[PDB]
Amino acid sequence: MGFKVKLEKRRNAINTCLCIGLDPDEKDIENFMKNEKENNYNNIKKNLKEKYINNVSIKKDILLKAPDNIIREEKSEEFFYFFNHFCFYIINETNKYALTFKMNFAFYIPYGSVGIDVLKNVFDYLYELNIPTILDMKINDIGNTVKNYRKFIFEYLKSDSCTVNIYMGTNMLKDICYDEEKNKYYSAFVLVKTTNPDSAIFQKNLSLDNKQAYVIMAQEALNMSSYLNLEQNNEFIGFVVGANSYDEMNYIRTYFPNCYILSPGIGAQNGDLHKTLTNGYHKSYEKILINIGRAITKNPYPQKAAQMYYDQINAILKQNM
Amino acid sequence: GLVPRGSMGFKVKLEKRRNAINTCLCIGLDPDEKDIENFMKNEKENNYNNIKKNLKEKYINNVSIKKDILLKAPDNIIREEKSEEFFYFFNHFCFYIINETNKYALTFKMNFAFYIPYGSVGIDVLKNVFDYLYELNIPTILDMKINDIGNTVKNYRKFIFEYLKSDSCTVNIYMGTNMLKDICYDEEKNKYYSAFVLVKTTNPDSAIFQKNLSLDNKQAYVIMAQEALNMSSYLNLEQNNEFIGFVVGANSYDEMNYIRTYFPNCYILSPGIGAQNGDLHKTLTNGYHKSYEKILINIGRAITKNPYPQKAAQMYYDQINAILKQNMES
Ligand SMILES: Nc1cc(=O)[nH]c(=O)n1[C@@H]1O[C@H](COP(=O)(O)O)[C@@H](O)[C@H]1O
Numbered sequence: 001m002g003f004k005v006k007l008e009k010r011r012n013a014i015n016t017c018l019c020i021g022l023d024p025d026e027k028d029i030e031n032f033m034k035n036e037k038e039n040n041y042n043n044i045k046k047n048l049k050e051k052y053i054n055n056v057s058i059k060k061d062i063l064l065k066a067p068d069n070i071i072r073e074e075k076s077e078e079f080f081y082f083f084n085h086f087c088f089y090i091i092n093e094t095n096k097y098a099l100t101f102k103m104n105f106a107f108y109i110p111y112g113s114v115g116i117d118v119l120k121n122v123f124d125y126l127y128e129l130n131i132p133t134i135l136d137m138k139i140n141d142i143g144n145t146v147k148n149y150r151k152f153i154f155e156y157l158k159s160d161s162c163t164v165n166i167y168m169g170t171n172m173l174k175d176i177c178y179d180e181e182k183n184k185y186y187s188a189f190v191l192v193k194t195t196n197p198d199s200a201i202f203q204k205n206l207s208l209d210n211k212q213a214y215v216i217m218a219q220e221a222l223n224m225s226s227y228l229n230l231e232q233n234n235e236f237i238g239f240v241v242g243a244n245s246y247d248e249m250n251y252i253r254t255y256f257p258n259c260y261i262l263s264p265g266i267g268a269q270n271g272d273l274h275k276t277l278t279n280g281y282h283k284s285y286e287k288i289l290i291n292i293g294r295a296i297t298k299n300p301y302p303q304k305a306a307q308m309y310y311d312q313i314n315a316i317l318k319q320n321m
Numbered sequence: 322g323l324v325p326r327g328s329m330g331f332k333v334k335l336e337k338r339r340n341a342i343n344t345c346l347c348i349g350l351d352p353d354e355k356d357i358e359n360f361m362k363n364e365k366e367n368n369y370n371n372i373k374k375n376l377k378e379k380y381i382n383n384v385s386i387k388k389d390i391l392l393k394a395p396d397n398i399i400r401e402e403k404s405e406e407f408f409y410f411f412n413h414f415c416f417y418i419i420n421e422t423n424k425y426a427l428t429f430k431m432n433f434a435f436y437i438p439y440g441s442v443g444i445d446v447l448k449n450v451f452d453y454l455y456e457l458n459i460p461t462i463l464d465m466k467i468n469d470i471g472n473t474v475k476n477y478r479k480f481i482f483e484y485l486k487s488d489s490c491t492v493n494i495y496m497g498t499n500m501l502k503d504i505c506y507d508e509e510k511n512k513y514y515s516a517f518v519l520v521k522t523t524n525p526d527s528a529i530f531q532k533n534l535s536l537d538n539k540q541a542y543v544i545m546a547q548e549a550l551n552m553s554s555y556l557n558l559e560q561n562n563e564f565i566g567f568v569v570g571a572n573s574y575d576e577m578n579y580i581r582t583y584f585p586n587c588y589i590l591s592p593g594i595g596a597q598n599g600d601l602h603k604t605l606t607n608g609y610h611k612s613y614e615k616i617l618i619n620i621g622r623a624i625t626k627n628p629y630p631q632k633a634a635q636m637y638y639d640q641i642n643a644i645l646k647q648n649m650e651s
């Protein structure tokens with residue numbers, strides 16, 4: 001059924017709220033290319049033994065080839081092959097510690113179409129493993145236009161959820177989280193308080209009747225969730241609250257006690273894991289997803305990086321229990 | 322004293338084209354699935370008259386992606402290349418619109434959302450569309466409303482300004498204006514780029530944050546506009562012939578007036594004429610600047626869903642130019 005149910009069931013199976021961010025940059029892909037040479041393509045060889053590699057949509061034949069053969073006979077496909085295999089490696093190494101994976105669209109678009117094929121294969125692979133997914137694309141537009149993102153994200157990729165910037169207004173959510181024609185409902189996290197250094201400029205400095213913009217925005221997002229009856233349908237509108245934004249995390253959790261929060265900003269952005277999880281804590285802890293991207297994906301051994309975040313999260317979750 | 326194509330800042334490119342064609346029409350190219358399907362059907366019914374005309378154009382030979390496919394005879398596509406049929410008819414639909422309408426366009430605006438919902442195939446089309454517009458030298462806007470943290474948003478900059486070679490893009494600065502340092506500036510190459518930030522949009526509930534939120538008796542959209550310009554100054558964009566401008570809906574007459582009043586020389590991009598029914602005389606009058614290119618009037622479906630887009634475009638060009646004339650003759 002809904003994302004609410006998928007998250008709950010996965011939390012029951014793995015007992016964490018780690019969200020692993022999969023945001024590969026050019027340097028990471030090139031590094032993977034290089035390491036794999038030095039290592040006799042060990043990680044790619046592992047990827048090929050996994051069963052679900054056989055269920056991805058795009059250029060499967062290419063993906064199943066030996067690296068040595070790709071490099072000589074399918075050179076034009078080398079970037080595709082190593083990019084896709086980088087993502088498969090990270091997933092295969094870390095999925096056992098992940099409540100959910102968040103892929104930031106920005107990392108999949110800058111080479112043109114090739115990265116979108118990779119992104120589709122990444123979502124196919126996670127769907128097959130039944131791991132909850134988030135597309136972080138911060139979508140926003142008028143209703144007629146945004147329906148195309150609903151199609152891309154929820155029908156093409158079959159994502160469970162996405163991120164949305166509702167500064168234009170909340171009506172867009174009607175065309176992102178709801179498909180009237182098909183009677184389908186989808187989940188989204190709206191930007192509330194972000195991690196960038198100048199985030200106060202509009203999110204805090206603007207207000208409406210003694211409340212900061214971020215509170216107004218959170219409240220209006222939940223009002224739209226209500227109008228749509230999302231939770232009735234096991235889907236939700238939640239909040240992106242920065243892991244370096246303790247006061248706001250604390251406020252949001254206090255005043256919206258049962259909201260779903262997605263919290264990026266730990267690791268590469270120096271956010272604080274203990275404070276973030278303590279301030280956003282909920283006993284149904286799928287309601288406080290702690291996103292870790294670069295601190296895992298730019299680590300020579302991502303499994304060990306994932307494991308340590310998993311263990312620390314779990315030790316903090318017990319403290320708060 | 323002459324600058325070659327591609328070797329000048331967006332400010333200069335817009336002003337030169339405005340001088341040439343004397344309009345502020347921005348043509349929106351937002352093809353939906355029905356548009357592509359309808360094009361395929363109509364071409365099939367008419368022995369591909371419009372595709373055959375596309376294939377005559379010299380610059381189709383200059384686009385980057387799958388020329389081997391694009392330049393095939395249409396009946397060969399249907400028979401021998403069925404897996405490339407959608408790519409071919411989608412790309413030729415966009416080329417057909419461009420070919421029929423470009424002589425009237427100050428700029429074309431492509432909304433990214435229309436090119437993504439089929440996966441990679443639409444991004445190949447979008448790349449070819451931007452390469453084609455670049456060859457024709459027609460000013461471009463990628464309407465993507467991009468936003469993210471600095472490290473992430475750089476990837477959009479690379480896609481939009483290096484891969485597509487767009488002249489400009491739309492940006493949502495609700496996260497903050499620091500992101501503009503990573504969009505309108507590339508520190509590594511020391512290159513500067515142009516953008517339009519969202520100020521007042523056309524959606525029916527746009528007031529809910531843009532007007533309802535305030536700081537010291539100034540509404541959010543005014544604060545956002547000022548902050549964008551402050552960053553533009555800091556970055557020295559206009560000294561490098563680039564700019565940060567504002568998206569202001571064609572239906573937002575009072576907001577357009579305030580913006581032009583308070584920021585007299587700002588660049589405004591105004592969607593909402595045509596399909597969305599905004600008042601053209603009211604918008605163009607409230608947003609008017611004697612340098613026409615500072616009030617771009619976007620028209621999309623009203624042109625692209627018309628059976629005769631060349632004529633539809635000519636009719637909006639003429640209507641706009643008539644209103645420009647009235648504003649110029651006082
Ligand atoms: N959506 C976001 C809102 C935000 O405020 N900060 C942030 O980092 N993100 C995204 O989360 C991820 C953080 O990744 P990392 O800093 O763990 O690598 C990236 O995809 C960011 O673009």
Ligand SMILES: Nc1cc(=O)[nH]c(=O)n1[C@@H]1O[C@H](COP(=O)(O)O)[C@@H](O)[C@H]1O
Nearest residue numbers: 145349432522523592596597620621622
């Ligand atoms: N960027 C926008 C901001 C906005 O407020 N309204 C709007 O319509 N747009 C875009 O302009 C175009 C309007 O096209 P049309 O209504 O003329 O077809 C579409 O790409 C919209 O997503």
